Amino acid sequence: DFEEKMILIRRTARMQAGGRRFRFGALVVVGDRQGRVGLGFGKAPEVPLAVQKAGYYARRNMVEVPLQNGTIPHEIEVEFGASKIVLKPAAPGTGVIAGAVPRAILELAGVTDILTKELGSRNPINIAYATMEALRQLRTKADVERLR
RNA sequence: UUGGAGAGUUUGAUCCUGGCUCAGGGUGAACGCUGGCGGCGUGCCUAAGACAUGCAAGUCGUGCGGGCCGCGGG
Ligand SMILES: [Mg+2]
Ligand SMILES: [Mg+2]
Ligand SMILES: [Mg+2]
Ligand SMILES: [Mg+2]
Ligand SMILES: [Mg+2]
Ligand SMILES: [Mg+2]
Ligand SMILES: [Mg+2]
Ligand SMILES: [Mg+2]
Ligand SMILES: [Mg+2]
Ligand SMILES: [Mg+2]
Ligand SMILES: [Mg+2]
Ligand SMILES: [Mg+2]
Ligand SMILES: [Mg+2]
Ligand SMILES: [Mg+2]
Ligand SMILES: [Mg+2]
Ligand SMILES: [Mg+2]
Ligand SMILES: [Mg+2]
Ligand SMILES: [Mg+2]
Ligand SMILES: [Mg+2]
Ligand SMILES: [Mg+2]
Ligand SMILES: [Mg+2]
């Protein structure tokens, strides 16, 4: 099993005669703090089901981060629409320096030491997607020598 | 490679653009309430407006001639 954290829980509305009627969403990451994270987005008529629905997707889309002594191997800059995330490798006693969104994403991934920065649209849902697709594009010296 | 966190606010709801605003550190500071000791710094940022009084540049008789006073003694 994994450690699980709810990063976002929001309410949205739609309109029809008689007035507004709501729907809830939850951005949820899940991970072992040992090289495995997954991000899931769940929407439902009530908070709990959405949180649970989210968790199922989180496990449905996962990714394997090549941790090297608790930091990422190389620079990664990634855009997701108008959102940009910078992940920069950091030495031992550094700490995890990121906003509560990529913080929880990287944290549950076993990342213990990292310099980061959000640029552009800091919309919670998009910055999430950009942090993940960044990891999914992380490589190591092995991976490289094998390609080339 | 010793180094980089963001949030609030346009919408019924969304994504984006965009500004406004905030949390930080800093100061020869000032103001309010309050105020026990000590150490080290430090204190007219305005009128280079105006200033009472004292003090801040003198020293040498191993350059010279003197006046006064004194010790000496003619
Ligand atoms: Mg890999
Ligand atoms: Mg772009
Ligand atoms: Mg975006
Ligand atoms: Mg390195
Ligand atoms: Mg912007
Ligand atoms: Mg924003
Ligand atoms: Mg660098
Ligand atoms: Mg910041
Ligand atoms: Mg408003
Ligand atoms: Mg409008
Ligand atoms: Mg409103
Ligand atoms: Mg803004
Ligand atoms: Mg201040
Ligand atoms: Mg005072
Ligand atoms: Mg007083
Ligand atoms: Mg003193
Ligand atoms: Mg002056
Ligand atoms: Mg005048
Ligand atoms: Mg006058
Ligand atoms: Mg004097
Ligand atoms: Mg002489």
UniProtKB/Swiss-Prot annotation:
Gene3D superfamilies associated with the record: 3.30.160.20, 3.30.230.10
Task: Give one Pfam hit by family name.
Answer: Ribosomal_S5
Q: Does the keyword Ion transport apply?
A: no
Q: Which GO terms describe its biological process?
A: translation
| Source superkingdom | Bacteria
The entry's cellular-component GO terms read: small ribosomal subunit
Indicate the segments forming the S5 DRBM domain, all copies: 2-65
Which PROSITE patterns does the record match to this protein?
Answer: RIBOSOMAL_S5, S5_DSRBD
Which keywords has UniProt assigned to this entry?
Ribonucleoprotein, Ribosomal protein, RNA-binding, rRNA-binding
Kindly list the GO molecular function terms attached to this UniProt entry.
rRNA binding; structural constituent of ribosome
* Oligomer status and interactors: Part of the 30S ribosomal subunit. Contacts proteins S4 and S8.
Q: What does this protein do?
A: With S4 and S12 plays an important role in translational accuracy. Located at the back of the 30S subunit body where it stabilizes the conformation of the head with respect to the body. Binds mRNA in the 70S ribosome, positioning it for translation.
What family does this chain come from, according to its entry?
A: Belongs to the universal ribosomal protein uS5 family.
Q: What else is known?
A: Is positioned such that it could physically interact with spectinomycin.
What does the entry's domain section say?
A: The N-terminal domain interacts with the head of the 30S subunit; the C-terminal domain interacts with the body and contacts protein S4. The interaction surface between S4 and S5 is involved in control of translational fidelity.
Full protein name = Small ribosomal subunit protein uS5
- In its UniProt entry, the species of origin is given as Thermus thermophilus (strain ATCC 27634 / DSM 579 / HB8)
Gene name, per UniProt, is rpsE
